[PDB]
Amino acid sequence: KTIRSRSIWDDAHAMLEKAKAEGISTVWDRAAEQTPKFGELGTCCRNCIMGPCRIANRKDGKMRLGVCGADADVIVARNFGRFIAGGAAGHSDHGRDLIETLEAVAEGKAPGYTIRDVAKLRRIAAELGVADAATRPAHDVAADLVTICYNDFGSRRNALAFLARAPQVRRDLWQRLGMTPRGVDREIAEMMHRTHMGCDNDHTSLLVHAARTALADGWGGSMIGTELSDILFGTPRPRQSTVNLGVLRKDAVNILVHGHNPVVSEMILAATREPAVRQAAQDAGAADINVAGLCCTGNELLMRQGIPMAGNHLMTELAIVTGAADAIVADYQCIMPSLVQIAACYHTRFVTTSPKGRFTGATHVEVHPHNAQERCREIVMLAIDAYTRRDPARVDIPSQPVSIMSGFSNEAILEALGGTPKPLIDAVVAGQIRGFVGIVGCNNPKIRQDSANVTLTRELIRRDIMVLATGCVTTAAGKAGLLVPEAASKAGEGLAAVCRSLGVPPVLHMGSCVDNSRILQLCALLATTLGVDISDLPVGASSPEWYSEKAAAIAMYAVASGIPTHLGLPPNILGSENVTAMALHGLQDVVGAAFMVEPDPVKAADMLEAHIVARRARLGLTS
Amino acid sequence: SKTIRSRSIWDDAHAMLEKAKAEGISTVWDRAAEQTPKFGELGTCCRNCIMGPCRIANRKDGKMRLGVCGADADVIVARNFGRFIAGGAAGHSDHGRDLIETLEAVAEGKAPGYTIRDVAKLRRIAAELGVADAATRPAHDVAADLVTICYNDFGSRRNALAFLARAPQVRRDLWQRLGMTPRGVDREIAEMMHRTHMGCDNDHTSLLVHAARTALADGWGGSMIGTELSDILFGTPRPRQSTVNLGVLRKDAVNILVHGHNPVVSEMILAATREPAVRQAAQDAGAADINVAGLCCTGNELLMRQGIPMAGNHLMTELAIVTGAADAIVADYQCIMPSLVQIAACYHTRFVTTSPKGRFTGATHVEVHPHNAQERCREIVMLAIDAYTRRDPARVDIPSQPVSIMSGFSNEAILEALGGTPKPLIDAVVAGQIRGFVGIVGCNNPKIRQDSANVTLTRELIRRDIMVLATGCVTTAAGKAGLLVPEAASKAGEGLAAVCRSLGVPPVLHMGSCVDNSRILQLCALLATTLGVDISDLPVGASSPEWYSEKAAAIAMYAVASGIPTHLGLPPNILGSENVTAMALHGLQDVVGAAFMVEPDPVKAADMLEAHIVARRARLGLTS
Ligand code: SF4
Numbered sequence A: 001k002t003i004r005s006r007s008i009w010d011d012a013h014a015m016l017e018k019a020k021a022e023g024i025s026t027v028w029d030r031a032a033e034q035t036p037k038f039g040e041l042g043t044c045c046r047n048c049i050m051g052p053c054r055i056a057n058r059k060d061g062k063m064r065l066g067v068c069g070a071d072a073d074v075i076v077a078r079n080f081g082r083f084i085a086g087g088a089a090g091h092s093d094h095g096r097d098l099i100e101t102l103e104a105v106a107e108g109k110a111p112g113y114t115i116r117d118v119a120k121l122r123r124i125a126a127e128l129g130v131a132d133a134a135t136r137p138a139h140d141v142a143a144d145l146v147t148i149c150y151n152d153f154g155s156r157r158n159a160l161a162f163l164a165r166a167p168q169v170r171r172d173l174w175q176r177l178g179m180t181p182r183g184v185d186r187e188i189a190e191m192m193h194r195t196h197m198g199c200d201n202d203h204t205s206l207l208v209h210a211a212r213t214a215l216a217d218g219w220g221g222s223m224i225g226t227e228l229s230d231i232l233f234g235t236p237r238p239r240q241s242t243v244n245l246g247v248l249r250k251d252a253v254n255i256l257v258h259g260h261n262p263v264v265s266e267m268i269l270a271a272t273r274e275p276a277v278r279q280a281a282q283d284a285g286a287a288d289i290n291v292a293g294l295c296c297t298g299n300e301l302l303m304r305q306g307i308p309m310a311g312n313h314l315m316t317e318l319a320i321v322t323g324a325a326d327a328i329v330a331d332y333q334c335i336m337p338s339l340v341q342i343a344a345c346y347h348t349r350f351v352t353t354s355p356k357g358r359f360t361g362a363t364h365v366e367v368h369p370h371n372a373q374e375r376c377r378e379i380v381m382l383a384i385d386a387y388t389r390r391d392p393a394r395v396d397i398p399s400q401p402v403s404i405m406s407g408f409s410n411e412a413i414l415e416a417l418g419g420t421p422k423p424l425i426d427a428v429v430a431g432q433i434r435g436f437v438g439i440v441g442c443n444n445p446k447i448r449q450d451s452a453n454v455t456l457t458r459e460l461i462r463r464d465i466m467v468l469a470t471g472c473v474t475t476a477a478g479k480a481g482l483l484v485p486e487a488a489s490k491a492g493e494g495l496a497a498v499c500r501s502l503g504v505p506p507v508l509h510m511g512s513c514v515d516n517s518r519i520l521q522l523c524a525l526l527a528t529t530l531g532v533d534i535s536d537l538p539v540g541a542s543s544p545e546w547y548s549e550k551a552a553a554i555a556m557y558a559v560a561s562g563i564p565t566h567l568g569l570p571p572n573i574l575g576s577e578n579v580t581a582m583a584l585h586g587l588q589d590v591v592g593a594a595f596m597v598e599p600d601p602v603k604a605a606d607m608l609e610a611h612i613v614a615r616r617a618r619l620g621l622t623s
Numbered sequence B: 001s002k003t004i005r006s007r008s009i010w011d012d013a014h015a016m017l018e019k020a021k022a023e024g025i026s027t028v029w030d031r032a033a034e035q036t037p038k039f040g041e042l043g044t045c046c047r048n049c050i051m052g053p054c055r056i057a058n059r060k061d062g063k064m065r066l067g068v069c070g071a072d073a074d075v076i077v078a079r080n081f082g083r084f085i086a087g088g089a090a091g092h093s094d095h096g097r098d099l100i101e102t103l104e105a106v107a108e109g110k111a112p113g114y115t116i117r118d119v120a121k122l123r124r125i126a127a128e129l130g131v132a133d134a135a136t137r138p139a140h141d142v143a144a145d146l147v148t149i150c151y152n153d154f155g156s157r158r159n160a161l162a163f164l165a166r167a168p169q170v171r172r173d174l175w176q177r178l179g180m181t182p183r184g185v186d187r188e189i190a191e192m193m194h195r196t197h198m199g200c201d202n203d204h205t206s207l208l209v210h211a212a213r214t215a216l217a218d219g220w221g222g223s224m225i226g227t228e229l230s231d232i233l234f235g236t237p238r239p240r241q242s243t244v245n246l247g248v249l250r251k252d253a254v255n256i257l258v259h260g261h262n263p264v265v266s267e268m269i270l271a272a273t274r275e276p277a278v279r280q281a282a283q284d285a286g287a288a289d290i291n292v293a294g295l296c297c298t299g300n301e302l303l304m305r306q307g308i309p310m311a312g313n314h315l316m317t318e319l320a321i322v323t324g325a326a327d328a329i330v331a332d333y334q335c336i337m338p339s340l341v342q343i344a345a346c347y348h349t350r351f352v353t354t355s356p357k358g359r360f361t362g363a364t365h366v367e368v369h370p371h372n373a374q375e376r377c378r379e380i381v382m383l384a385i386d387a388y389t390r391r392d393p394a395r396v397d398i399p400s401q402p403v404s405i406m407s408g409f410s411n412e413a414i415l416e417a418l419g420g421t422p423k424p425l426i427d428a429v430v431a432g433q434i435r436g437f438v439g440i441v442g443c444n445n446p447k448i449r450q451d452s453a454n455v456t457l458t459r460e461l462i463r464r465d466i467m468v469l470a471t472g473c474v475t476t477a478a479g480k481a482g483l484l485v486p487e488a489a490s491k492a493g494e495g496l497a498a499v500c501r502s503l504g505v506p507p508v509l510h511m512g513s514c515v516d517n518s519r520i521l522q523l524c525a526l527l528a529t530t531l532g533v534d535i536s537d538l539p540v541g542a543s544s545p546e547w548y549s550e551k552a553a554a555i556a557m558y559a560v561a562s563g564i565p566t567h568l569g570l571p572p573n574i575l576g577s578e579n580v581t582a583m584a585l586h587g588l589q590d591v592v593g594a595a596f597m598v599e600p601d602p603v604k605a606a607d608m609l610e611a612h613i614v615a616r617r618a619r620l621g622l623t624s
């Protein structure tokens, strides 16, 4: 009965029983061992060896301050600052890689890569100030855009380049508060400086720079990553695909791409479509080479190529347990190192491709733009060889894939509306669509897998609130059949009408974790057109099953941009009443939004709907 | 009280610990007594995501051997230590970046009261880094071009940091093969925070290699830019006399204590106290003078360039307020204990913060920037004079009499003492008069009796003809024991005493603040370049007997990664992993040519540093 309580899906239940009988420990098993304190409240501090310090509520009054004299407010806010910095650094390095990949294309030093979307390149470059971006040669225009993006990774700017997309009132508010992101790397470095012993000892000051650090992610690292990926590999358009472990085929070579970087996974797919490589699969007894995605790199291949997704966070271990995973191609971020051990229990080849994502015991085939075509060809060959060593008795692909619709970039959304946001604004004014909520969460073993994600998605569309899905929720919403146009039947009367009018699902898949920058861009476009602030728009954000530092950075820059953000579990901040009050209430007075911590998905829909209604009133609209 | 005598070796510290106990004031030793009790000290506690936190323990049932994500002790300890190093590099990185912004303000003409005090060093540094016509163009044009170069080291488009060219070719080629070449000061910090995220870098060798790269971006980037631009803006240090300990505070004067690391504020504070209208405000209040005294590294900075006396080091900062004569504390950022704000409220003292980065709840914030510093610092000295009129004379007790010291031993001053070349210094090392050099760069740590290890190790090394280069907190330790004066050659060995008397210098050279440990890198790289060898071939060493901060770990790491055997008094939070520990103590020797040494006995630490110096003298074909 424990296996039934760990997830809500049959394919996950099937593989949990399979690993149990085979003696394979999963992420849920190791979570039970680690359940048993001071670090979870954020009141443990390890920032120097004057002593590991813990702040307790003791009867005798001892241990109330650290050795240096820091109180619980400073200690909690510093750990939280480093937590956001690590989340921002995640997206930061990703955007920088995309800058390097575009610079290699511009220099002509990336065989097999091209500028797939030249029209978006000219638009983005013109938006950011590149002279004659409309008419100059594409590679020259790309080089000037590369310089611009790199300069946001420098230390000589007053505001990040894409920050111009925000409404003027939002930018003036950032100026007054001192939150204006100046440089992508610089805010990260200043956060690490402030959290050092004896530097920043004011929890209000620390949280304001956390907002500044997280804003440098959403409007810098992530937005550069999203826009440059569309330039290099194509801007997403609506298309059909499938989800869950059933996307693996018994008769094919199954290559699972895992991580966040489309630079590697896009070239993997190109190699599996080469004629000589497809021949090697048939020679090994396979009908084809089947590429399926995992986590954010899967979301990227889903949006731009329609490649089916095997599963989200907690499904990554179970996909190897199917016995049909012939290789796992990893880059970096959110790749559990337990996959290496579970792959050793089978024939699966675990291949790492990035100098930043090294895993002891893995097969490292380092991929760079100048050798990607050759290296990825070599990586696909290792998957065909591993296929010949597959043990057929241990194969169990549990379910049948579920149809989904993906590729809802802002470009695709506006094209569906006829090239303007006016029909969308009209529906919101009419009350057909009462608001929007972006669900951006992960999975967390503390919560039954996707129970909160699917319930909250169902609750919101019932109340005529459209849902924008990124990250892990894509698999959650898709498995429940909410990512298809026919799912309008499960929405309210107004939302179903608008969805059927446009032929779109009530849940729009807008991409990976960095593609939450698409939600910032969309909100900024609506606020600009209406002449109001983002904090005036009937919008919301939710992370019901989050776990990572990157999720908290996403939650933080949504709040600081005026988007009320709900979290299923609290961050490690409850040890300080002041820091907790600031996150839940005080931030509303400053940036116009705040955090919400609610483990009940229905109560969370009530809170998100309440803020949406209050903002409809301030626009002079009926709920 | 026998407990008070066990916490320091200095009478001016004992005298204030009695005073603090008499008045019910709790110090840093009292709070350290409460925080003695575990996994974080071994480094096996991970809080990088709310899928835990996770503790790696050893239980007979085999449970809790991996994190929820599956990470083992090696990865967890390495990521904690990696983030520990990144925090230290970030402290120096932001300090260096501010020095760039000040120089740009001078170049733009938007910093009233600031100048280019050392134009000759500006042209020299700019020419070294590739500025065209640095010798002849207008100074502000040259400064603007040097600012661009430094800023680009804080960008993401370079393959190697600008000052890395000072390193020997064999050292740079070695960094290239290992993948340690520092590319950008902020970038390595950001990549470290990326690598330590869940599910990114899960190989402890990979993590420590980038820890070395991150720390090298401090020593050859953030700190070196900070040191060299500070000399350009506020002057290159020259040898001079001064005093240390709490006796530098005067009962008859307005006592202003500068605290932190940034000379940009303290230099302008000092200029404000010499304005006639400000000196009048003090005289109108009944004071004989305005007395500025330094604390921590900013005190080291004012000591090197102005000769301003130092009140004390890390653990003395609380006691200086207890004297009752501290009329104001002017703070910028870093290593400023927030308990000072509360202790100042026990007296008349004004606690003033000046930086947007160093904010303290309950403090008086008068934010200083280059464009308003002359006006703002004038306002800050006035607050010190006003607080002086409210001083309680019954609570004043300045315990000891100041000790004479000699300071200001920049590499420029050292080469000038040698006739403009390192040849006499090389000759003494070849002759065996100076058997080696060791930089003692430590802090204070309440776990260790204050300066007991620093002073013992300093005495032990100079006795064995090993010259000691002192930075940071050790400056106060060496000075109080009377080792920072030329007459202290009598306490050195026969060979070292002879060389010291020939040059008229102490056997312990004070080379500046914590960021000025980049001066030691510059000196080592200069000797290795002259000799045609690697830094790992020089009879050199580094020691931090009483360290505590992330900055000390970053300094120790870029010393090791540069080939300098580094001794630590206390171990970093890494003992939870045998592999990470073996790599730090032994494995790194095979990779970068040096390793960490953890030894709490100062005499045994002198034995270890002397052994490596002897081994390297042998490989140079010299008499050991
Ligand atoms: S920074 Fe302060 S609270 Fe944190 S470990 Fe060091 S002494 Fe303790």
Ligand code: SF4
Pocket (backbone or CB within 6 Å): B046, B047, B048, B049, B050, B051, B052, B053, B054, B067, B068, B069, B070, B071, B076, B197, B198, B199
């Ligand atoms: S990163 Fe891994 S070891 Fe660290 S807290 Fe998260 S699950 Fe636990």
